[PDB]
Ligand binder design. Structure first.
Ligand code: HEM
Length: 386
């Protein structure tokens, strides 16, 4: 359910001027229609995230509990600490070759094609293949794995009651499949360990505590939910920017060391996740606004990422920033566990693309935004190499 200031399709595809205006009028505002507080300014987004005691990640138990994302300390702290070791930049760095092999593979499958969808053909599959490798999905089981991960976040045929129904069947059908499949794999690895993440998670120990199989199960479902579409949107949003501003593409193709800046600046400018939800746990005054216990507090990273108070040239895509303290991965204790992996898949994806040569956006597409108003990315983006 989107905010009323976002009217057309073209605004969903570039709402940043809208959010910027809103940030100037009211850094905090209550939207009666959506029954929530929106926060647009960086300093107050940072503060919300940095104070889990005031602003909670907990959710109504009717909605699913996506593992650590929807926990508060002290529980969140214990579980994160058990899954942490596997996601640091050093821990995953060794995957660079495999991720390179995959991106090479995916681009080789579209060589004689004169145009292709970066989503379906490249950016969508890369995270699925990688997290499959990482988790320990055998290669021979990827097809169904990919299929229901795809199904997990599928769009709709229309925004009706009929197609929203159909989609939610499909999504939920995938969560069920994936819960069954992992439950099967967790169990497999529970009694015979393999050289993979699921096994590594089962063996973790901190203060004598282990994760339960159900915690590993839920964490594995989270990695797909949290890790696939967002990374896919990173690669696609980046390819989108690099075809909207070709000089940026060509600058980075010539100084390939700029790709890490390209990735952070894509995250800042075209953030795959544009908003973070919290439920207020106490009454708290933000500026002059009186936020009450129980109220929903949406912090907009896409607005925050462009705050004149924190970022120079906030509406200009710059690959030479000295710091890029966006909140596209959040901030604080819930800071994306997958940022090193997303940053590496992002880096490799952009590199292989640039090394293949110039590429351009294909003429006369109807760019279709992702349905959620918390997500920023497109369902399809056709490009062509020259
Ligand atoms: C560009 C890609 C990604 C973006 C933009 C992104 C964004 C985020 C954000 C904003 C949060 C914090 C949400 C909150 O504070 O409530 C988060 C959390 C998380 N992300 Fe991502 N994510 C990305 C990729 C990934 C990947 C690839 C993985 C793993 C494969 C991953 C795993 C997680 C997990 C497990 C959490 C929960 C951490 C916690 O709650 O303590 N993310 N992500």
């Amino acid at each position: 359910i989107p905010m009323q200031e976002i009217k057309s399709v073209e605004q969903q595809l570039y709402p940043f001027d809208i959010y910027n205006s809103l940030r100037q009028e009211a850094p905090i505002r209550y939207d009666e229609s959506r029954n929530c507080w929106d926060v647009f300014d960086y300093e107050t987004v940072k503060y919300i995230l940095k104070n889990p005691s005031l602003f909670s990640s907990k959710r109504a138990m009717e909605e699913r509990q996506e593992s650590i994302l929807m926990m508060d300390p002290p529980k969140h702290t214990k579980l994160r600490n058990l899954v942490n070791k596997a996601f640091t930049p050093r821990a995953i760095q060794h995957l660079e070759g495999h991720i390179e092999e995959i991106a090479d593979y995916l681009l080789d499958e579209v060589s004689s094609k004169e145009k292709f969808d970066i989503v379906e053909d490249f950016a969508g599959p890369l995270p699925i293949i990688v997290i499959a490798e990482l988790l320990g999905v055998p290669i021979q089981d990827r097809a169904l794995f990919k299929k229901y991960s795809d199904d997990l976040v599928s769009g709709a045929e229309n925004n009706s009651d009929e197609a929203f129904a159909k989609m939610m069947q499909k999504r939920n059908e995938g969560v069920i499949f994936l819960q069954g499949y992992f439950k099967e794999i967790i169990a497999e690895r529970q009694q015979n360990k393999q050289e993979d993440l699921i096994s590594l998670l089962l063996e973790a120990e901190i203060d004598g505590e282990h994760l339960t199989e159900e915690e590993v199960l839920g964490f594995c479902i989270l990695l797909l939910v949290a890790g696939n579409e967002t990374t896919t949107n990173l690669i696609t949003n980046g390819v989108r920017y690099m075809t909207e501003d070709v000089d940026v593409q060509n600058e980075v193709r010539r100084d390939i060391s700029l790709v890490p800046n390209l990735v952070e600046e894509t995250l800042r400018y075209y953030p795959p996740i544009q908003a973070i939800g919290r439920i207020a746990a106490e009454d708290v005054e933000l500026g002059e606004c009186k936020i009450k216990r129980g109220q929903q507090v949406i912090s907009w990273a896409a607005s925050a990422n462009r705050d004149s108070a924190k970022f120079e040239w906030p509406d200009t895509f710059v690959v030479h920033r000295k710091t890029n303290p966006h909140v596209s991965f959040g901030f604080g204790i819930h800071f994306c566990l997958g940022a090193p992996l997303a940053r590496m898949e992002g880096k490799i994806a952009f590199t292989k693309l640039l090394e293949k040569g110039g590429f351009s956006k294909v003429q006369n597409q109807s760019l279709k935004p992702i349905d959620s108003p918390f997500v920023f990315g497109v369902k399809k983006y056709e490009i062509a190499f020259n």
